[PDB]
Amino acid sequence: ADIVVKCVMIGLILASVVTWAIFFSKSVEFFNQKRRLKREQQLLAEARSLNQANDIAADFGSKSLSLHLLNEAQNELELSEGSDDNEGIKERTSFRLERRVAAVGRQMGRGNGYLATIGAISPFVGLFGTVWGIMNSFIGIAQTQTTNLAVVAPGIAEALLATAIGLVAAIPAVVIYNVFARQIGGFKAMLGDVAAQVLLLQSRDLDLEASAAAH
Amino acid sequence: LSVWGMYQHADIVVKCVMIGLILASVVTWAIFFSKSVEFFNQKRRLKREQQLLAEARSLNQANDIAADFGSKSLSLHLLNEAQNELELSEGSDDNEGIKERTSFRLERRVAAVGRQMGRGNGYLATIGAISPFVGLFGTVWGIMNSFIGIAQTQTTNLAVVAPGIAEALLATAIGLVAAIPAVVIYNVFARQIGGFKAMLGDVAAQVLLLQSRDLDLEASAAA
Amino acid sequence: SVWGMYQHADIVVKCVMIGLILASVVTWAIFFSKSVEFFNQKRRLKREQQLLAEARSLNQANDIAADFGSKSLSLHLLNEAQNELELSEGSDDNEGIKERTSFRLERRVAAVGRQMGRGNGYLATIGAISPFVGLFGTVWGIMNSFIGIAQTQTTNLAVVAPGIAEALLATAIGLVAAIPAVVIYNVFARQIGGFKAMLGDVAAQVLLLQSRDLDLEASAAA
Amino acid sequence: ADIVVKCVMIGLILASVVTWAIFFSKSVEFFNQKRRLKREQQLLAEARSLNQANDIAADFGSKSLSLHLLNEAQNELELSEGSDDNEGIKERTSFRLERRVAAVGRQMGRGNGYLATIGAISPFVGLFGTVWGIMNSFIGIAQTQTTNLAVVAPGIAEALLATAIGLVAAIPAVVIYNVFARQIGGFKAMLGDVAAQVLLLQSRDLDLEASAAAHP
Amino acid sequence: LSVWGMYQHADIVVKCVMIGLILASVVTWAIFFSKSVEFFNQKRRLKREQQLLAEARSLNQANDIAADFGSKSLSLHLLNEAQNELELSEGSDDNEGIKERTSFRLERRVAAVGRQMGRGNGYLATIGAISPFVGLFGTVWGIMNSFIGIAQTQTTNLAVVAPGIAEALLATAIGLVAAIPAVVIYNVFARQIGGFKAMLGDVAAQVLLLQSRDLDLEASAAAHP
Amino acid sequence: DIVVKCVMIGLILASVVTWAIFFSKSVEFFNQKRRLKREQQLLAEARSLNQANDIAADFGSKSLSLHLLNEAQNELELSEGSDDNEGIKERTSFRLERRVAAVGRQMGRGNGYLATIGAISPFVGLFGTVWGIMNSFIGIAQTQTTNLAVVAPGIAEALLATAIGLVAAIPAVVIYNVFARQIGGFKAMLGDVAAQVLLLQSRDLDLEASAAAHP
Amino acid sequence: NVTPFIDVMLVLLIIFMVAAPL
Amino acid sequence: NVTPFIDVMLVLLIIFMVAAPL
Amino acid sequence: NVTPFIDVMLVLLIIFMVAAPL
C-alpha cells in the first residue's frame, strides 16, 4: 500500500524475469554448442595426419571453433617456416591452444555472473522487501490500537510471502549458475579433449618429418 | 491423519511444489539405483580384466589376452590407443616422444572415462543443494494458510489448527528425505568414481609399463 | 514522511542516518566513476588487442604500438619486453630470457590488477557492515521508544507507535545502504577478473612474439 | 547503576578505546611504511645490475627492508663463493626471499588478532548485562509489583543500552580489521614485487656471468 | 543478593548446574595460566636459538653452535633429523632426493610439534560449546519451578516468579561467564600456536637452507676442480 | 499430550543413539589407539623396507602399518622392471594417501549423526514445550481467566520437554568434539606411518639407483 | 552443513504462535 | 558454498517475531 | 579458523529468548 513495497515487488519480479530469460537463452546456447562440439569431436576423432584433419575440417563452417584450432595449428606451421627448432614450435603451439581453450571458456562464461549476482542480491532485496512489508504490516497496528491480531493476521501474513517472492527468484539461479559452473566444466574439458589432440596430430607429423630428415 | 488427506488440507502452490519435491526424490532414487548397479558391474568387469592383464609382460601378450575383451572393454580401448600410437609413429627414431604422446593420450582417455562416469552426478549435486531450499519455499506456501483459516474461524484450538502443524511437518519431512540421501549418495558416488579412476589409472600405468619395456627392448636391440 | 520521522529522532538516530546516506553517496559515486573508467579501459584494451592480433614479429608490434598512447598498458608490456631485450644483450640463454620476461609479465599483470582494485576495500566494508549498523540504529531507536515510554509513564500503543516505527525505519535505511554496495562490489570483482584475463591475453601475445623471434633468431644462428 | 552491568560497560569501553588506539598507531606506521616503500621501489625500478642496485640502496636507511632483501641476496652471493651451480643459488635465494617476505607480513600482523577477537566477542556481553538488568527489573517490580508495560520500560531501556554499547564495540573493530587485512595484502604484494626485482637482478647477473665465463 | 546467598536460594539441580559451570571456569583459568607461561618460555627459547643460529654458515658450524642448546631444544632436534638424513643417505648420488626427504620430514615435525602444542585446547572448545547448555537447562528448570510454585499455590503474582526469574537468568549469566573467556582463550591460543608454527617453519627452513648450501658446495667440489 | 510424549520418546531414542555411538566408537578408539604408536616406535629404526618387513613380520594381519607395507610391496612387485622410479613413488604416494584417507573416512562414521542430534535436540524439546503452552493458552482462552494459578502445570510439564532436549543434546556435542579430536590425532599418527613408508621406499630406490649408477 | 534444517521448525513454532493469542 | 546466506534472513524473521506478541 | 562455530549457539540463545517473554 506504499511505494517501497511496490518498488521492491516489481524489482523482485523483474529480477526473476531476467533470471529465467538468461536461463532459457543460455540453455539452448549451451545445448546447441555442446552438441555441435560433441559431433565435431566424433568427426575429428578419425584423423591420422594433419592434412587429413584439414580435409575433415574443410566442411565445418566458419564459426566451428575446432576449425579455429586447426587455423591456430596451421598458423604455427606457417609462421615458423624456415626453422630447425620443432620443440619451440610445439611449446608455443601448446601455449596458444591452452590460451584458446581458456578463451572459449571465458566466452562461455559471459552472462553467468549476471545470474550469480542476481541470485546473491535477490536474498538481500528480498529481506528488505519483507522489512518494508513488515513496516506496513505495522505502524497502522499501533496507530489503530490493535491488540487483537485477528484484524492484522492477514496484515502480518504475507510479509512471509515476500520471502516467497525472494527465494525462487534467489536460490536456484546460483544453483543454475552452479549448473552452469559444471556444464562449462563439462564443456572446457571436452573442448580440452580436442585441441591438444590437435597438438598430437602435429606432434607426430613433425616427429615423422624430422625423422624422415634423419635418414 | 494420512498424507493425501493433509494434501487435501493444502492449496495449489504447495501442492505443485510438493509434487516437485516427490518427483525430485523419485528421480534421485532412480539415478541412485541405476548408477549403483552400473558402478558395480563396471567394477567387476574392470577387476576381472585387471586380474587378466596383470600376467602380461609384453604388449603382444596384452593383445593376445585382449583378443576377446569385448566392444566396450575399456582396457582393450587403452590397448587400441597404444596400438594407434604404434601404427601412426612408424618410421620414427624418437621412441621417447612416442611414449610421451602415448602417456598423454592415456591420461586424456582416463579423464574421458572419469567424465563419462559422472553424468547424472551434476543433477545429484543440484538436488542435494536445492532440497532444503525448495523444502523451505514449499514450507512457506504451505504455511501461509493458518493466518487465513483462523481469520475465518475465530477458533484457536485442535484440528482447526493442528493439521497445519502436521502439514508443515510433512512438507519438510519430505524435504529431509530429499535432502540427506541426495548429499550422501553424491558423496559416496564421488568416492566410488575416485576409486574407479584410481584403478583405471593403475591399468593405464600398467599399459605404459608394457609398451615402455617393449620399446626399451626394441631400442636395445637396435643398439 | 522521511524527514518528519527524521524530526522524530534523537541525536544518535540522526548521526547513524547521515552515516548511512553519506556511505550510500560514496558508494554511488565510486560506482559511477569506476564504471565509465572500466568501460573506457576495456574499450581501449579490446581495441588494442584487435590491433595487435595481426602482429607477427616484435618490431612489427613496435610499428603497431607507436601510436597507442602513453598510458597504453600493451605498450607498457612492450616496454618491459624491450627492457628484457636490452638487459639480455650479450647473453646466450634464450630460455632464461623467456623465464625472466614471463616472470616480469606475471608481476606487471598482478600490478595492474592491483591498480584496478582501488576503492573496492571501501566497498566490501560498507556492504558488510551496513546491515549491522542498520541493526545498531534499530537498537538505538528501540531504546528511544522505551525512553519515550519512560517520559510518558503509560501503557498505550499510541505511545509505542513513533519510536518503534522509527526504529523500523532505521532498519529499512540500513538495508537501503546495504544492498547496492554488495552489488557494485561483485560487479567490479567480475569485471576486474575479466580485465586481468584480457591483459593476460595481451601478455601472452607479447610472449608469443618474443618466443617466435628468439627461436627464429636461434635457428638462423645455426 | 548496576555493578556487573557497569563492569562489562567499562570493559566494552576500554576494548573500544584500545581498538581506536591500535587503528591510529598501525595506520600512521603502516602509512609511513607504504610511503617509504613506494619511494624506494620507484628508485630501484631502474637499475641494470645488482651492484648498481647496491649503489642505489647505499643511499637507503638502516631499516629499509628492500636493503635487507639485498643483504639476504648478498649473503647468498658470499656463501656461494667458489660454487659451480647457479640454479642452487637461485633456489636458495628465492626461498630465502619468500621466507623473509612471509616474516615481514607476519610482523605486519602484530595486534590484528586482538582486533578480530574483540570484534567477535563484542555482541555477547552487553546482552549479558541486558539479561542481568532485566532480571533485576523483574525482581524490583515484583517486590513492588504491577501488571502494566509502563513500569517495566526504564529497566529494559537501561538494559538495551548495554547491547548498544556492545554493537559500538563490535562494528568498527571489524572495519579496522578488514581494512588492515587488505592493505597489508597489498603491502605484501608490493614487497613481493620488490623481492621479485631483487631475484631478477641476481638472476640477470648470474646468467651474464655464466655467459661471459662460458666463452673466454 | 550474594552469590552464596542466591546459591542457597536456588534449586539443587540449579546448584549442580552452577557448580559444574564454576568448575569449568576454574579449569579454564588454570589451562590458560599454565599454557600462557609455558608457551611464553618456549617462544623465548625459540627466539633465542633462532638468533643464535642466524649466523651459522655451514651445517657442521650449526652443529658446533647447537652442541650446547639443551635437551629438548627443538632446533637441535631439527638438526638431529638433518643429521639422520645425512647418515641414511650415505652411498647415494641424488642431492635432490635428500632435500625432498628432509624437507618432508621437517614439515612433518613442524606439524607434529604444532599438534603437541594443542593439548587441552579442545577441552576449551568443548567448554565454550556446552557452557550455555547446562545454564539453559538450569534456566528452564528454574522457570519450571516457578510454575510449580504457582501451581502449588492457588494465587499468582510476579513475586512467585521473581526468585525463579532470578535463578533462570542467573544460570544463563553463569553460562555466559563460562562461555566467553573460554572462547577468548581459545582465540589467543590458536593464533599464538599458529605464529609459533610459522616461526618453527622459519627455523627449519634455515636448517634446509644450510643443508642445501653444503650439498651444493659438495657437488661443486666434486664436479669441477 | 500424546504429541508431547511422542517427542519425549524421540528425544529418548536420539539419546540412546548417542549412548550406543559413544560405546562402540570409544571401545574401538581405546583398542586401536596405542597399537599404531607402539608399531611406529618399533619402526623408528627400520632403515630399509626389507628390514621394515623384518620388523613387521609379527605386527599381525589387522596392523594397518602392515597393510601400508602390503601396499608398498604391491607397488614394488607391480613395478618390477620399471626404469622410471619417480612414477612408482608418485603412484605409491597416491595409493597411500588414498588408503590413509579411506581409513580416516571409515573410522569417521557415526559422527554426523551425533552432530545432528546435538544440534536438533533442544529445539524439538522447545516445540514440545510450546505445544504444552498450546494446551495452556487453550485453557486460558476457553476458561476466560486472568489467573495463572489454574494454568501453570501445563507450562511446567511443557518446560520439561525442553529440559529433556537439553539432556539429550549435551553429551552428543561433548562426545562428538572429543571423538573428532581423537580421529584427528589418529589420522596424524597414520600419516606419520605412511610418511615413514614413503621414506623407506625413497631411500631404497635412491640407493638402488646409486648402486646401479657405478658397478 | 546439516545445521540449517531448523528453519521449517522455526516457521512451525511461529505459526503456532500466530494462533495462541487469538 | 553460497548456501549459508540465509542466516541474516533468519535473524530478520526472528526480530520481526519479537515485536508481534507485543 | 575453528572460531566461528559459536553461531549455532547464538541462534540457540536467541530462540530460547523468543520463548521467555511469551
Side-chain angles (χ1 to χ4, degrees), chain C residues 107-149:
Chain C
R107 301 302 299 164
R108 188 172 179 85
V109 171
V112 176
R114 290 190 295 274
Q115 187 272 332
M116 300 297 283
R118 290 185 179 92
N120 295 316
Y122 294 97
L123 299 175
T125 50
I126 289 167
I129 71 167
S130 299
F132 295 98
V133 301
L135 192 275
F136 171 69
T138 300
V139 168
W140 183 259
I142 290 168
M143 183 172 172
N144 292 327
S145 68
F146 286 108
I147 286 168
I149 300 166

Side-chain angles (χ1 to χ4, degrees), chain E residues 165-188:
Chain E
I165 289 170
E167 292 173 358
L169 299 178
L170 187 271
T172 305
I174 304 174
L176 292 175
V177 169
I180 283 94
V183 175
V184 175
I185 290 161
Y186 186 76
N187 290 120
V188 296

